[PDB]
Amino acid sequence: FDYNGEKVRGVNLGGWLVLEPWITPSIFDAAGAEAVDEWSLTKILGKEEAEARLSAHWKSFVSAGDFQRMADAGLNHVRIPIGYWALGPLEGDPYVDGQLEYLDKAVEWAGAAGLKVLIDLHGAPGSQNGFDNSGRRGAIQWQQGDTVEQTLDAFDLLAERYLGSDTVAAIEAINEPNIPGGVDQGKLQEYYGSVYGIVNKYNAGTSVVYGDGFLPVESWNGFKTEGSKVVMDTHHYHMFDNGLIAMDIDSHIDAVCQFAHQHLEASDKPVIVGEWTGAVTDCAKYLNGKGNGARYDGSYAADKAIGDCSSLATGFVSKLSDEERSDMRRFIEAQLDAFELKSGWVFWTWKTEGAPGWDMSDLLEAGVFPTSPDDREFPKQC
Ligand SMILES: OC[C@H]1O[C@@H](O)[C@H](O)[C@@H](O)[C@@H]1O
Ligand SMILES: OC[C@H]1O[C@@H](O)[C@H](O)[C@@H](O)[C@@H]1O
Ligand SMILES: [Cl-]
Ligand code: NA
Structure with a gap:
């Protein structure tokens, strides 16, 4: 795929092969208050029952028809999180495997629908x-002990399994390595070099995707600058920062444009906005972690409430008003046009149990998500 010269238009399959409480709260809640992540969920259930419940979800959550709907929506990419444990749980891990059979199906189904897949190693040993x-959740132990070598071991098998397919256009080293949370950048760059070498052992045609680690994406200038070969992934969200979450619709749109002009256009590499969304609040149930509240309504970090989370926590955008859907679409259109100034975009996420603004499958049916670059209800922003 020509990341240097063509626009990525994608969606994520969040919550599918790496489960997240906010994406599928019912599954976590069926295992009680202490099931707060895939680790704890699988530990609580035990191996046999975890395999049963998680495999039921792997099978039901995604079909070939999902991929066809993505293609019908004007997409060309699907970003697919997978955890290291799919490639072999480590000694003592509660995790169960079996996801690879489903990722195999996704590659087939994506190909059939004319889509490329970006495989994303979304969870590494130690976190x-x-x-x-x-x-x-709850500590960063990646880079301790043998965790990096274990990450490369899993990455190697992942690359070995999939990079023979032209459907698999790109592979991401690791999702959101948390530099401000204590991931060492120099060591991260060494892991990035090793990942590049693994990709080139199997298929030098495949692009390597690197997260910016929450640093400004342009701070990565002069590292692995290689045209289409090396693509930066930056994630752009407006509900995890006090300044952004306080904004009205016009200010949100301006901040999207500023981000594109000051950050995306400042990078010496292709840059996808590999996660972004339609929501402007952090009201979705469990978004900040199961058992944590929301900035928006004052129930996180002693933030001062801006509004209530009564409408935006759960459900489907049909529950909202015409004006609320309209503003949501305005924010989405601005993001599409801003992010296509650089290399494109990958929405988070395809499907949920009802998280207003976060669920592309919902937003498409509701007429909120555009289906082409020409499908615009509002003037072009940015
Ligand atoms: O917080 C929203 C989303 O942010 C994404 O970066 C993470 O990579 C997802 O796994 C998460 O659901
Ligand atoms: O990229 C989105 C992520 O941003 C981080 O700053 C937050 O701590 C996460 O909760 C959020 O998922
Ligand atoms: Cl960033
Ligand atoms: Na909530």
């Missing part, structure tokens, strides 16, 4: 970020 979505 590269302390997020629930790494598998295990």
Whole structure:
């Protein structure tokens, strides 16, 4: 795929092969209050029952028809999180495997629908970020002990399995390595070099995707600058920062444009906005972790409430008003046009149990998500 010269238009399959509480709360809640991440979920259930419940979800959550709907929506890419444990749980891990059979199907189904797949190693041994979505929330132990070597071992098998397919256009080293949370950048760059070498052992045609580690994406200038070969992944969200979450719709749109002009256009590499969304609040149930509240309504970090989370926590955008859907679409269109100034975009996420603004499958049916660059209800922003 020509990342240097063509626009990525994608969606993530979040919550599928790496489960997250906010994406599928029912599954976590069926295992009780202490099931707060895939680690704890699988530990609580035990191996046999975890395999049963998680495999039921792997099978039901995604079909070929999902991929066809993605292609019908004007997409060309699907980013697919997978955890290291899919390639072999480590000694003592509670995790169960079996995801690879489903990722095999996704590659087939994506190909059939004309889509490329970006495989994303989303969770590393020890946790590269302390997020629930790494598998295990609550400390960063990646880079301790043998965790990096174990990450490369899993990455190698992942690359070996998939990079023979032209459907698999790109592979991401690790999702959201958390530099400000204590991931060492120099060591991260060494892991990035090793990942590049693994990719080139199997298929030098495949692009290597590197997260910016929460640093400004342009700070990565002069590292592995190689045209289409090496693509930066930056994640752009407006509900995890006090300044952004306080904004009205116009200010949100301006901040999207500023981000594109000051950061995306400042990078010496292709840059995908590999996660972004339609929501402007952090109201979705469990978004900040199961058992944590929301900035928006004052129930996180002693933030001062801006509004209530009564409408935006759960459900489907049909529950909202025409004006609320309209503003949501305005924010989405601005992001599409801003992010296509650089190399494109990959929405988070395809499907949820009802998280207003976060669920592309919902937003498409509701007429909120555009289906082409020409599908614009509002003037072009940025
Ligand atoms: O917080 C929203 C989303 O952010 C993403 O970066 C993480 O990579 C996802 O796994 C998470 O659901
Ligand atoms: O990229 C999105 C991520 O941003 C981080 O700053 C937050 O701590 C995470 O909760 C959030 O998922
Ligand atoms: Cl960043
Ligand atoms: Na909530």
